Structure 1
Amino acid sequence: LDSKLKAPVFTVRTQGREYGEFVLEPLERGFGVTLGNPLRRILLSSIPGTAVTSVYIEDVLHEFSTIPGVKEDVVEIILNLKELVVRFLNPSLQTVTLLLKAEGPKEVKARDFLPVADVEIMNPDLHIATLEEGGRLNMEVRVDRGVGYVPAEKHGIKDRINAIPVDAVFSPVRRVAFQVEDTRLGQRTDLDKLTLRIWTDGSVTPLEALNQAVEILREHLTYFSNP
């Protein structure tokens, strides 16, 4: 009947700003998935981030058109624009518009975007497009702060008539995996070992992500306080 046991030790394994592994053991029976699932849900849906929500390109009507002088189609450019990782230096800032104008033979990278105050580009070596001789690319991209994943048709934002709405990938967290393995402390054989695996884009580290995630949860627990 008598039950008294020690609080679990939190173990951390981190490689760069991209990836981390988080081990929590021992836990009481079942608590491995009790902690793991909500955190996974929060980590994917609710973690604050940035995304490209809209794109305008000169002489381009719709998304499925092509660009004379450029090999990639408008589709492929928008894809690369989704992989763009933008970090806002200031909390006040909500939305930005980044302009890119280039021509001649060139391979356009994310670094080529004209710098904005308190806006950092985490992946400057990301390849947006290649331009040929006579190839002309003039474009403006709409970058917003939000959470989770919003398809293009859901926000549907347009600054002008030719602006193409882009699926907004807000989540700095790319993937969350967790697994519970049986572990034993002394004669207690049903105990849980929680392991979390988090992939981010580097804008927010996995440890930062997990910390933000557990805070959101705790704050939601305070909502049962005053009826």
Structure 2
Amino acid sequence: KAPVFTATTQGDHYGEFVLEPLERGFGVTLGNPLRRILLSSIPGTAVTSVYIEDVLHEFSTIPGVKEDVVEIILNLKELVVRFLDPKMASTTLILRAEGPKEVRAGDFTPSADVEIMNPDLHIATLEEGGKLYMEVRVDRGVGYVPAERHGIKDRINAIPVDAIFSPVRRVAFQVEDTRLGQRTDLDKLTLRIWTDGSVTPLEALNQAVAILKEHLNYFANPEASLL
């Protein structure tokens, strides 16, 4: 009846929260809903497709590049950006690098208003005289949308890719029986939220609670159809 909700975070990635004490059973009522929404909602960057020169098939190898096509696709999925203005819900990032080089997420050519929050990342290695050019597509949304789902092709040979939407990675809360004075039936519910960096766990959770009470207030206007 007097919750002490606190938070222990680190950087923009990891964060923890403790709502203690509480009534028996409520910790669960809080745990799943917050969790289910934190990974199925919460808008974010999520790169979608990519195009590449000389590379038509998503299989056929690209000479001059150490890694194959797929490896690059993966590294591209791990990458994360952000849109500064709410107006742009879709942009296009580009890049070109020749000769021997260490290609990175930083080496990526700029965009209108897009900041790559993940500058240091391995994308691909280029051998002697390696010709590489690619134009990636980045939209916004929520949840998970595999290559099967979105059929995006902004070019002739473009290659749809898994969309990592939810900036969050894994939550997995835990409720433990806590004791204060009398009545050991109490909830010490603790939540550990992981974020890619788009938003710190604090902001993510605080967004979730909004997506919660908002949905809750949806019960206003009864309509009596009595059977």
SS in 1 for 2:177: strand
CA RMSD of aligned residues (A): 0.9
The match for 1:212 is 207
What CA distance in whole angstroms lies between the structure 2 residues aligned with 1:132 and 1:49? Answer: 34
What CA distance in whole angstroms lies between the structure 2 residues aligned with 1:216 and 1:190? Answer: 29
| TM-score, L = length of structure 2 | 0.96
Residue 143 of structure 1 pairs with residue 142 of structure 2: no
What CA distance in whole angstroms lies between the structure 2 residues aligned with 1:208 and 1:68? Answer: 44
The match for 1:105 is 100
Deviation at 1:170, TM superposition (A): 0.8
What CA distance in whole angstroms lies between the structure 1 residues aligned with 2:45 and 2:212? Answer: 21
The match for 2:40 is 45
Equivalent AA in structure 2 for residue 121 of structure 1: I
Deviation at 1:71, TM superposition (A): 1.1
Aligned equivalent of 1:68, options 47, 51, 63: 63
The match for 2:151 is 156
Aligned equivalent of 1:124, options 91, 98, 119: 119
CA deviations over 1:151-177 (Å, ceiling 9, x no partner): 011011111220000100011001112
Aligned equivalent of 1:29, options 24, 27, 52: 24
Residue 168 of structure 1 pairs with residue 168 of structure 2: no
Aligned equivalent of 2:6, options 3, 11, 14: 11
SS in 2 for 1:80: helix
Q: Which moved more, 1:215-224 or 1:181-190?
A: 181-190
| TM-score, L = length of structure 1 | 0.96
Deviation at 1:117, TM superposition (A): 2.3
The match for 2:174 is 179
What CA distance in whole angstroms lies between the structure 2 residues aligned with 1:73 and 1:200? Answer: 29
SS in 2 for 1:175: coil
Deviation at 1:214, TM superposition (A): 0.6
What CA distance in whole angstroms lies between the structure 1 residues aligned with 2:36 and 2:91? Answer: 28
Residue 199 of structure 1 pairs with residue 174 of structure 2: no
What CA distance in whole angstroms lies between the structure 1 residues aligned with 2:180 and 2:215? Answer: 32
Residue 57 of structure 1 pairs with residue 41 of structure 2: no
Q: Counterparts in 2 of 1:82-101, with a 5 A limit?
A: 82-101=77-96
Equivalent AA in structure 2 for residue 163 of structure 1: A
SS in 2 for 1:64: coil
Deviation at 1:127, TM superposition (A): 0.8
What CA distance in whole angstroms lies between the structure 2 residues aligned with 1:214 and 1:141? Answer: 33
Q: Aligned residues, how many?
A: 222
Deviation at 1:36, TM superposition (A): 0.7
Moved over 2 A (4+): none
What CA distance in whole angstroms lies between the structure 2 residues aligned with 1:94 and 1:144? Answer: 6
Percent of aligned positions that are identical:
89
Unaligned runs of 5+ in 1: 1-5
Unaligned runs of 5+ in 2: 223-227
Equivalent AA in structure 1 for residue 46 of structure 2: A
SS in 1 for 2:141: strand
CA deviations over 1:158-211 (Å, ceiling 9, x no partner): 112200001000110011120000012221211111100001011111000000
